[PDB]
DNA sequence: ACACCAAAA
DNA sequence: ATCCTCTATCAC
DNA sequence: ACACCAAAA
DNA sequence: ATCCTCTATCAC
DNA sequence: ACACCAAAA
DNA sequence: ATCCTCTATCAC
DNA sequence: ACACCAAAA
DNA sequence: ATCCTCTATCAC
């Protein structure tokens, strides 16, 4: 019954052209994934406490206080970018496309492979035997309904190979659990203590404890079988493949010239000030670009570092990613900073626990905000404020000297409009559930792709217990057969697009790449050494000039 | 803005042996939940390993 | 329960 | 004998 | 007035 | 002889 | 890909 | 053989 | 063996 | 289950 495969390995990218340019996109992931016995037999509700840095005064922002729940499952997250097309596909896309949109995920797993190891040679010296067990099985199960919560593992840089011909593993699925910590506010060194850090005990109100095998129908795989999903469609929104650039200062109507250059040095000029016809907000009797009446407001002030707390205990806020702007005002405009290693990214001949990061900024121009030059003046507007009638980015706020006006000013509002973040190629996530809120976030920063309806259930995972001639359930703790496999996972992803069209006349910024330099888009980076490492690198979504009005 | 009942309606008289009665309203609304949440920004999904 | 507000409910 | 300020869920 | 923007307007 | 950056309210 | 979450998907 | 916490995209 | 490479293989 | 760099001797 068996000795005969299950599956077929495939691993391709099909770009399958239609009319008016619209295109259908279809990604092949196949991979060896690599699995062993789950240490806990059981379901742990373990607590975490960093007192070791929850306990200095300064340290606040470093609290890790929670208390998760260890199943003996493991899961299996595809939903990153990187797991299905190839660093070239995404230039090819990004350069040529206008939009994109998930359809439908397909995920298959096959040719399962188990093996019981047992650690010989006490008569000689210390060796290892390895060979399979055929009776033994595997565990599949697929939460389709979604009865336990949400785990993306691109929350943790814990997905699959972003590189088909080396093998991979699974994250364990762990998961959250009701407290109610609670730490004090200090700063430094300051005086006194800290007065209470605590951490908890469970509420019945609150309590939830989900079984792997009580809600979902587990599927026994031996190394014949072979495990198949449905055919998930996805009812989501498309993400344009455009950056901007116009901001409130350049929205229609440019000021009337009245000066016109002589020479390509010179410029021209507009008409007085006093004298010049338009609209405007402010009383005073003149005209300027800077007060003059715009559409709506592009882009907003966002709160820094807006540490806030619940029963759950602090955390900075999220917020929309935006251009970070001359200011390089980074934390000010949300860009983000992703930690990702071997096997997903990192160089690979690269020494050292040390994980590679990189900081994401967001190419939304227009929209983004320098704290610098953030201005608010007063009443009745006065040609060049005084001094009392002006706040700026100098001043400091309720007795503090770097604390300014900016990290508690929130600009947002009805007027308030924007645009929707961009994805980051590798390491990125795709799609993500939504919050069971009855009111809803206009957005998740976690991903490009929200679900309007129910989502892809998550795929758990698990290796059978192979028992031994000796057991006892009132028995202490007990032995299992030495055992762990292996078997392939395959999907498919398919996606929709349509190709830009060229209307301007000036080319435009495309992504390539450039010779052997210390340019950030060298070849060389996307290529192997000598022994074959290699490294994968964020690219570019948007290199093209879209337009918002 | 100075409005009057007897303006505005149709006024019905009752007497002892009359009796009155509406028509069916239909509501057009939205559900509401009956379970209370917990979850806060420090426990939403994959919890470190 | 149309009959979802300004049209063709 | 309830339908968005009339008659008139009249707009069915 | 379809023709509501990314599909099957 | 106007439909969301082409042709092409082409998607009717 | 209906099957858009609370009904008449 | 994935549909919004069951069976059950069961509501087609 | 059409199926000869850029169309109407 | 081989057709000119995909799917697709898909162009039959
Ligand atoms: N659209 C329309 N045209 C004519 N008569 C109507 C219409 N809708 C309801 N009615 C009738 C039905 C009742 O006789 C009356 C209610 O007011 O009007
Ligand atoms: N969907 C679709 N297919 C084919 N021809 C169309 C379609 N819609 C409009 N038209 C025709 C009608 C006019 O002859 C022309 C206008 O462009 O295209
Ligand atoms: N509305 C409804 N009534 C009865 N049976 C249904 C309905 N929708 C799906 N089904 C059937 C189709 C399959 O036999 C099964 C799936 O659950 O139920
Ligand atoms: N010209 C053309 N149009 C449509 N389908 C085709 C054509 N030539 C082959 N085929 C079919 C025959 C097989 O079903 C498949 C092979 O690819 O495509
Ligand atoms: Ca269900
Ligand atoms: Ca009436
Ligand atoms: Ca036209
Ligand atoms: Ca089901
Ligand atoms: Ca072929």
């Known amino acids: 019954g068996v000795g005969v495969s299950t599956g077929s390995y495939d691993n391709q990218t099909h770009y399958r052209f239609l009319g008016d340019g619209w295109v259908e996109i279809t990604a092949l992931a196949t991979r060896l994934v690599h699995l062993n016995m789950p240490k806990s037999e059981n379901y742990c509700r373990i607590r975490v406490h960093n007192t070791t840095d929850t306990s200095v005064k300064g340290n606040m922002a470093k609290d890790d206080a929670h208390e998760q729940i260890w199943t003996p499952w493991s899961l299996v997250d595809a939903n990153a970018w990187g797991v299905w097309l190839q660093p070239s596909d995404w230039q090819y896309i990004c350069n040529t496309m206008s939009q994109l949109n998930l359809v439908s995920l397909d995920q298959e797993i096959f040719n399962v492979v188990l093996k019981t190891v047992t650690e010989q040679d006490s008569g000689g010296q210390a060796i290892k035997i390895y060979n399979n067990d055929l009776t033994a099985c595997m565990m599949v199960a697929v939460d389709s309904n979604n009865i336990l919560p949400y785990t993306p593992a691109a929350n943790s840089m814990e997905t699959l190979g972003f590189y088909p011909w080396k093998p991979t593993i699974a994250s364990p699925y762990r998961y959250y659990f009701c407290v109610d910590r609670d730490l004090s506010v200090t700063y430094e060194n300051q005086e006194g203590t800290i007065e209470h850090n605590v951490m908890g005990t469970p509420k019945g109100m609150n309590s939830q404890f989900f079984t792997i095998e009580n809600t979902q129908q587990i599927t026994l795989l031996r190394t014949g079988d072979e495990f198949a999903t449905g055919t998930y469609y996805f009812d989501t929104n498309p993400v344009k493949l455009t950056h901007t650039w116009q901001t409130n200062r350049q929205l229609g109507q440019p000021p009337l010239l009245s000066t016109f250059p002589e020479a390509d040095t010179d410029a021209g000029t507009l008409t007085a000030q006093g004298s010049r016809h338009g609209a405007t907000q402010m009383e005073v009797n003149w005209v300027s670009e800077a007060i003059r009446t715009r559409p709506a407001q592009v882009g907003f002030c966002q709160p820094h570092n807006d540490f806030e707390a619940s029963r759950a205990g602090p955390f900075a806020a999220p917020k929309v990613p935006a251009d970070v702007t001359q200011g390089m005002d980074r934390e000010a405009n949300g860009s ?38 953030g201005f608010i003046q007063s009443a009745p507007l006065v040609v060049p404020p005084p001094l009392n009638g002006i706040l700026t980015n100098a001043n400091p706020i309720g007795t503090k000297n770097d604390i300014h006006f900016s990290n508690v000013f929130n600009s947002y509002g009805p007027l308030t409009t924007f645009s ?85 006349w000036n080319p435009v910024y495309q992504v390539s790449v450039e010779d052997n330099g210390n340019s950030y888009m060298s070849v060389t980076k996307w290529l192997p050494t000598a022994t074959g490492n290699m490294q994968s690198v964020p690219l570019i979504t948007r290199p093209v000039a879209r337009n918002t009005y």
């Open 336 to 373: 983000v900073r992703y930690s990702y290693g071997k096997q997903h990214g990192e160089n690979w001949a690269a020494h050292g626990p040390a994980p590679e990061r990189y900081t994401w900024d967001e190419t939304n121009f227009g929209s983004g905000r320098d704290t610098r030059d």
């Open 420 to 504: 929707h973040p961009s994805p980051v190629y590798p390491q990125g996530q795709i799609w993500d559930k939504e919050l069971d809120l009855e009111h809803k976030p206009r957005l998740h920063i976690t991903a490009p792709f929200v679900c309007k309806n129910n989502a892809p259930g998550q795929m758990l995972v698990r290796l059978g217990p192979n028992l031994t001639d000796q057991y006892d359930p009132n028995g202490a703790t007990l032995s299992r057969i030495v055992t762990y496999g292996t078997f392939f996972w395959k999907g498919k992803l398919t996606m929709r697009a349509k190709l830009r069209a060229n209307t301007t």
